[PDB]
Amino acid sequence: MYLRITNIVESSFFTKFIIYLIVLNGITMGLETSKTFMQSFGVYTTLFNQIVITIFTIEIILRIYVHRISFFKDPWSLFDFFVVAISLVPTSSGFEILRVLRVLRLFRLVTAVPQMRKIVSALISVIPGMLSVIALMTLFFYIFAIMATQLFGERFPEWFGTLGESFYTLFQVMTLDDWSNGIVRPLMEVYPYAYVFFIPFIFVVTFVMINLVVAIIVDAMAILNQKEEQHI
Amino acid sequence: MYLRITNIVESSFFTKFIIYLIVLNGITMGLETSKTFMQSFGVYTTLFNQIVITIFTIEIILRIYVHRISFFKDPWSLFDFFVVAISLVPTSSGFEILRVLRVLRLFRLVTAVPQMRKIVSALISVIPGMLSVIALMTLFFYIFAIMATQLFGERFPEWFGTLGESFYTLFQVMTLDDWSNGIVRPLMEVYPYAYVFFIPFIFVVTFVMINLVVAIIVD
Amino acid sequence: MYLRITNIVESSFFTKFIIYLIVLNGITMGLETSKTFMQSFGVYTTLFNQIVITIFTIEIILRIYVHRISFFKDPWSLFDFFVVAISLVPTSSGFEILRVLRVLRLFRLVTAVPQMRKIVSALISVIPGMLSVIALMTLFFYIFAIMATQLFGERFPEWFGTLGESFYTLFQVMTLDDWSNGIVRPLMEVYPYAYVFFIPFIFVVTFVMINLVVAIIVDAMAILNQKEEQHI
Amino acid sequence: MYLRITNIVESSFFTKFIIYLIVLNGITMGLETSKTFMQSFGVYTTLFNQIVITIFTIEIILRIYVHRISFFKDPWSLFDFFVVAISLVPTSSGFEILRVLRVLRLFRLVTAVPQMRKIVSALISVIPGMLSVIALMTLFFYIFAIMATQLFGERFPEWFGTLGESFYTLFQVMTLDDWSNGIVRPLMEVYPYAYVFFIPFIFVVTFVMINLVVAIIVD
Numbered sequence: 041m042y043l044r045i046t047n048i049v050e051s052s053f054f055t056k057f058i059i060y061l062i063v064l065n066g067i068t069m070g071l072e073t074s075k076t077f078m079q080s081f082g083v084y085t086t087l088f089n090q091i092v093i094t095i096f097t098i099e100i101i102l103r104i105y106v107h108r109i110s111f112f113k114d115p116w117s118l119f120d121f122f123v124v125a126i127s128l129v130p131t132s133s134g135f136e137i138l139r140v141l142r143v144l145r146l147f148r149l150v151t152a153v154p155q156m157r158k159i160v161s162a163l164i165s166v167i168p169g170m171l172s173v174i175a176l177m178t179l180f181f182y183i184f185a186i187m188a189t190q191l192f193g194e195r196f197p198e199w200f201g202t203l204g205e206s207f208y209t210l211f212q213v214m215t216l217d218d219w220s221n222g223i224v225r226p227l228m229e230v231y232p233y234a235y236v237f238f239i240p241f242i243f244v245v246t247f248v249m250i251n252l253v254v255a256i257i258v259d260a261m262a263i264l265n266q267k268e269e270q271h272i
Numbered sequence: 273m274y275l276r277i278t279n280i281v282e283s284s285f286f287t288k289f290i291i292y293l294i295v296l297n298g299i300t301m302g303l304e305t306s307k308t309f310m311q312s313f314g315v316y317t318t319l320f321n322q323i324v325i326t327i328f329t330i331e332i333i334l335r336i337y338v339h340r341i342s343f344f345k346d347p348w349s350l351f352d353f354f355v356v357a358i359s360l361v362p363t364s365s366g367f368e369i370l371r372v373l374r375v376l377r378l379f380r381l382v383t384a385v386p387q388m389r390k391i392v393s394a395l396i397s398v399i400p401g402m403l404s405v406i407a408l409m410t411l412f413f414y415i416f417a418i419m420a421t422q423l424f425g426e427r428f429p430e431w432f433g434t435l436g437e438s439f440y441t442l443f444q445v446m447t448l449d450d451w452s453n454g455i456v457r458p459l460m461e462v463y464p465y466a467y468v469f470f471i472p473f474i475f476v477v478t479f480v481m482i483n484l485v486v487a488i489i490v491d
Numbered sequence: 492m493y494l495r496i497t498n499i500v501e502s503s504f505f506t507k508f509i510i511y512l513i514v515l516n517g518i519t520m521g522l523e524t525s526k527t528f529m530q531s532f533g534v535y536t537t538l539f540n541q542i543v544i545t546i547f548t549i550e551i552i553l554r555i556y557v558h559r560i561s562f563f564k565d566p567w568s569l570f571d572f573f574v575v576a577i578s579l580v581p582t583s584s585g586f587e588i589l590r591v592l593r594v595l596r597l598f599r600l601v602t603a604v605p606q607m608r609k610i611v612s613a614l615i616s617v618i619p620g621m622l623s624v625i626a627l628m629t630l631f632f633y634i635f636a637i638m639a640t641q642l643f644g645e646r647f648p649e650w651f652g653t654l655g656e657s658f659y660t661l662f663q664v665m666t667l668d669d670w671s672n673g674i675v676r677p678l679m680e681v682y683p684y685a686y687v688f689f690i691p692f693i694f695v696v697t698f699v700m701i702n703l704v705v706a707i708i709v710d711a712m713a714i715l716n717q718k719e720e721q722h723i
Numbered sequence: 724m725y726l727r728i729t730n731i732v733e734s735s736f737f738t739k740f741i742i743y744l745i746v747l748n749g750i751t752m753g754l755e756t757s758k759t760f761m762q763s764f765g766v767y768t769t770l771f772n773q774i775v776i777t778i779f780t781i782e783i784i785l786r787i788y789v790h791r792i793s794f795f796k797d798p799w800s801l802f803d804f805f806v807v808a809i810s811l812v813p814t815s816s817g818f819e820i821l822r823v824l825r826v827l828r829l830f831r832l833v834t835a836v837p838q839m840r841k842i843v844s845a846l847i848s849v850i851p852g853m854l855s856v857i858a859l860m861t862l863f864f865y866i867f868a869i870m871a872t873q874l875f876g877e878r879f880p881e882w883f884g885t886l887g888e889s890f891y892t893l894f895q896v897m898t899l900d901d902w903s904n905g906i907v908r909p910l911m912e913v914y915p916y917a918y919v920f921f922i923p924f925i926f927v928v929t930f931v932m933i934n935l936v937v938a939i940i941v942d
C-alpha cells in the first residue's frame with residue numbers, strides 16, 4: 041500500500057511520461073487555436089484534451105498518497121494542486137475563463153523539468169528585499185491616484201475617473217507609454233498646470249525603480265555575503 | 273513632577289493610534305472616490321475627516337513641546353507640520369486649490385512607521401553624489417532648450433514656442449515618448465535637418481543618464 | 492604546394508588586401524542605394540560585386556586547402572564560409588530572394604579583424620548562462636499567446652485570436668511599445684478585465700529581464716571575485 | 724612684455740569674474756529667448772552680448788601667450804576657443820544658424836569649473852573603452868539600413884526610401900519608440916514578414932546595449 045506504490049511514482053520515465061504528456065497537450069493547444077486544424081481533426085484534440093487531463097489527476101493523487109503531509113508543504117505541488125484542479129471544474133458549458141485557465145497546465149512543464157525550478161526560484165529569491173520597496177509604491181499611487189480623480193475626473197473620466205481608472209492611468213504613465221502626447225498634453229490643454237502632477241511623479245517613479253537595481257546587488261547580495269562566503 | 277506630558281507622546285502605543293488613525297483617514301478619502309458613496313454615507317465622512325484634523329493639530333502641537341532640540345530640525349515633523357497646516361482651510365486672501373493638497377497627509381503612514389522610514393532614507397541615501405550631474409544636465413536641458421525655441425518657435429509654437437514650452441518637449445524626447453513621428457518626423461518637414469539636434473541630443477541625455485546608473489553601484 | 496599557399500594566406504598582405512577589399516565594398520554598397528547612381532555608373536559596381544565575390548570564393552578554397560580541418564571547427568570561420576557561399580548566388584534572375592542577404596558579406600570584417608571578435612565574444616559569452624531562461628520565456632509566452640487567440644481574437648483579428656498574431660502583439664507589449672492606449676484600452680472596452688492579462692503579464696515579463704541582466708552583471712562580477720580572494 | 728600678465732590670469736580672481744559674466748550672459752541668453760523681452764528691452768542689451776564677447780575674445784589672447792604651444796594642446800581650452808569664434812558672427816551673416824550657435828558659449832560653465840571639468844573626463848573616461856563597441860554597431864545599423872531600401876522603401880519611401888531614411892527609422896526602432904504600431908505593423912499590410920527583419924534586429928540591438936552597460940565597470 042506504500043512500497044509498490046512509492047517506487048512507481050518516483051520513476052525515471054513516468055516523469056518523462058507526464059513530461060511526455062505536458063509537452064504533448066501543449067502542441068494540440070497550438071492547433072486547437074487555428075480552426076483550420078480543428079475542423080479537420082476536431083474530436084481528436086477535444087477528447088485528447090480529456091484523456092490527458094486524467095493521467096495528471098492520478099499523478100497528483102498518487103503523489104498525494106506517497107508524500108502525504110509534505111505534498112501540502114510544496115508550493116510546486118500545491119501549485120500543481122492549484123493548476124491541475126482548476127481544470128477539474130466544468131469549464132465546458134460555462135464561463136469563458138476556466139476554459140482558458142485550464143491552459144495553465146503548461147505552467148506544469150515549469151513544475152516538471154528540474155533546473156527550471158531553481159532559476160524560477162532564483163527569481164522568486166528576489167521579492168523579500170523588494171516587498172519593502174513594493175509597499176512604499178502602493179501608497180505613493182493610492183495618494184497620487186486620488187489627487188488625480190479630483191482634478192481631472194469629470195473632464196477626463198476614461199483616464200482618471202473612478203480611482204481604479206486613476207490606477208490604470210497612473211501605471212501607464214509610469215512605464216511612460218504614450219504619456220507624453222497621449223495623456224499629459226491633452227490634460228495640459230484644459231488644465232495647463234497638470235505637468236506639476238506628472239513630471240515629478242515620473243521622477244519619483246523611475247528614480248525609485250532605478251534605486252532598486254542599485255540595491256538588488258547591494259541589499260540582496262549582502263545576505264549572500266554574510267553567511268555563505270565567510271564559510272571560506 | 274513637572275512636564276508629565278512628554279511620557280505619552282513617546283511610546284510604542286501612540287503610533288497604532290495615530291498610525292491607525294492615519295490609516296483610517298488614509299482610507300476615507302478613497303471611498304470619497306465612489307460617487308455614490310458620498311451620497312448615502314457622506315454624512316459620517318465629512319466629520320470623520322475633521323475629527324482627526326484637530327486630533328492631528330492636537331498630536332502635532334502636542335509633539336511640538338516634547339521635542340525641541342531637534343523638532344523644527346526634524347523635516348519629517350515639519351513635513352507633518354506643513355501637511356497638517358494646509359488641511360485647516362488657510363485664510364490668506366486666496367482661492368480654492370488646496371482642498372486637494374490635504375490628502376498629502378496620508379504620506380504620514382510613512383512619516384511615523386520606521387519600515388516606511390528606513391526606505392525613504394535609502395531613497396535620499398545618495399541623492400548627493402548625484403545632485404551635481406542633475407545640475408549639469410539641467411544646464412544641458414537649458415541650453416538645448418534655448419536653440420530649440422531659437423530654432424523651431426515660429427513654425428512650431430505648440431511644441432516649442434517659449435522657453436517653458438521647449439522644456440516640456442525635450443523631457444518627453446528624453447523619456448522618448450513617441451519622439452520620432454510624434455515630434456521629429458514633422459519638424460523635419462519645414463526643416464529637413466532637424467535630426468542632428470535629436471539623434472545627438474538623444475544620446476547625450478541617455479548616455480549621461482546611463483553612466484549615472486553605473487557610477488553609483490560601486491557605492 | 493602546401494607550404495607555399497600557406498605563405499599567401501595568413502600573411503600581413505592578406506590584411507592589406509581582404510579587410511581593404513571588404514571596406515571598399517561597404518563604401519560601394521552605400522551607393523547601390525539612392526538609385527540615381529545605378530542608372531549612371533552602376534555597372535562598375537554590379538560587377539565590382541563579382542571581383543569581391545571571386546576574390547572571396549577563392550579564399551573559400553585557399554583556407555580550406557591550408558587549414559584543411561582547422562577551418563570547419565573555428566567559430567569565426569564557418570561564418571565567412573556561410574557569408575560567402577550564401578552570397579554566392581545568381582546575380583539577378585529568379586524570384587529574387589537572397590539578393591538582399593548578400594550585404595552580410597560586410598560582416599566579414601568582424602571575422603578578419605581580431606578587435607571585433609573579442610567584443611562579439613564579450614557579448615555572446617553571456618548567452619548560455621541564460622539559454623534556459625530564454626526558454627523559460629518561450630514557455631511563458633506560449634501559454635500566453637494561446638491565451639490570446641482564445642481570448643480577444645474574436646473581435647481583434649489584427650492583434651490576436653491566432654497563435655501567430657498574438658506572439659507578436661505581446662512582444663510589442665513587452666517592450667511597452669504604444670501598449671496601453673494603443674492596444675489595451677481598446678480590448679478593455681470590449682472586455683474591461685483585459686488588464687488582468689497585461690497588468691500582470693507586464694510586471695512579470697519586465698521582472699524576469701531585470702533579474703536576467705542583474706544576473707549578467709553579477710555573472711561577470713562573481714568570476715572576478717574568486718581569483719582575487721584566495722590570494723591578495 | 725611676454726611674461727607679465729600671467730599674474731592676472733593664474734589667479735583666484737580671474738575665473739569667477741568670467742563665470743559671473745557667463746552666468747549673467749547665461750541668464751541674459753535664456754532671456755534672449757523671449758517673444759517680448761528681446762523686442763521691448765533686448766535691443767538695449769543686444770550690446771551686452773557683444774561687449775561680453777569682446778571681453779571674452781581678449782581673454783583668449785593672453786591665455787594663448789601664457790601657454791605658447793600649450794593652449795591648443797589642452798582639451799577644455801580648445802573648446803571655448805572655437806566656441807567663441809562661432810559666437811563672433813557678424814550681426815548679419817549668410818545663414819543665421821550661427822546666431823543660434825551663440826548659446827554654445829554658455830558651455831564655458833563646464834570647462835571652467837573643475838567639478839564640471841573632470842566629470843566630463845569621467846564621462847569620456849568610458850567612451851574610449853566603448854569605441855570598442857560603438858563601431859561594432861554603426862556597422863550593424865548600417866547594413867540593416869541597406870537591406871530596408873531594397874525591401875521596404877518603394878512602398879514606404881518616407882521611412883526606408885534611402886539610406887538616411889533607414890538610418891532614422893532604425894535608430895527609431897532601437898529607441899523602441901512607437902515602432903510596432905507606428906512603423907512595423909503598417910509594413911505588414913504590404914510585406915508580411917517585415918517583422919522577421921525587425922524583431923531580432925530588436926534583439927541584436929537590444930542585446931548589445933545591455934551587455935555594454937554590464938561590462939562598463941571594466942572599460
Ligand SMILES: COc1ccc([C@@H]2Sc3ccccc3N(CCN(C)C)C(=O)[C@H]2OC(C)=O)cc1
Nearest residue numbers: 448665666667697700897898899925926929933
Ligand atoms: C527581448 O526584446 C526586448 C525585451 C525587453 C526590452 C526592454 S523594454 C523595457 C521594459 C521595461 C523598462 C525598460 C525597458 N527598456 C527601455 C529603454 N528603451 C526605451 C531604450 C529597454 O530598452 C529594454 O530593456 C533594457 C534594459 O534595455 C527590450 C527588448
Ligand SMILES: CCOC(=O)C1=C(COCCN)NC(C)=C(C(=O)OC)[C@@H]1c1ccccc1Cl
Nearest residue numbers: 202203204205206207208209211683686687690
Ligand atoms: C474587480 C474590480 O477590480 C479591478 O479591476 C482593479 C483592481 C482590483 O484587482 C486588482 C488587480 N491588479 N485593482 C486596481 C489597482 C485596478 C486599477 O485601477 O488598475 C489596475 C482595478 C480597477 C479599478 C477600477 C476600475 C478599473 C480597474 Cl482595472
Ligand SMILES: O=P(O)(O)OC[C@H](O)CO
Nearest residue numbers: 070071073074653654655
Ligand atoms: O496556422 P495558422 O496560420 O492558422 O496559425 C496558427 C496555427 O494554429 C499554427 O498551428
Ligand SMILES: O=P(O)(O)OC[C@H](O)CO
Nearest residue numbers: 434435436437756757760
Ligand atoms: O518662461 P518665459 O520665457 O515665458 O518667462 C516668464 C517671465 O515671467 C516672462 O518675463
Ligand SMILES: O=P(O)(O)OC[C@H](O)CO
Nearest residue numbers: 423463464465466469820
Ligand atoms: O536652417 P533653417 O534656416 O532652416 O533653421 C532651422 C534649422 O536649420 C534646423 O533645425
Ligand SMILES: O=P(O)(O)OC[C@H](O)CO
Nearest residue numbers: 136642682683684685688
Ligand atoms: O470574456 P470576458 O468577458 O471574461 O473578458 C475577458 C477578460 O476581460 C480578460 O480578457
Ligand SMILES: O=P(O)(O)OC[C@H](O)CO
Nearest residue numbers: 874914915916917918920
Ligand atoms: O513578403 P515578400 O516576399 O513580398 O518580401 C518582402 C519583405 O522582405 C518581407 O519582410
Ligand SMILES: [Ca+2]
Nearest residue numbers: 218450669901
Ligand atoms: Ca507612442
Ligand SMILES: [Ca+2]
Nearest residue numbers: 217218668669
Ligand atoms: Ca511608447
Ligand SMILES: [Ca+2]
Nearest residue numbers: 448898899900
Ligand atoms: Ca519607448
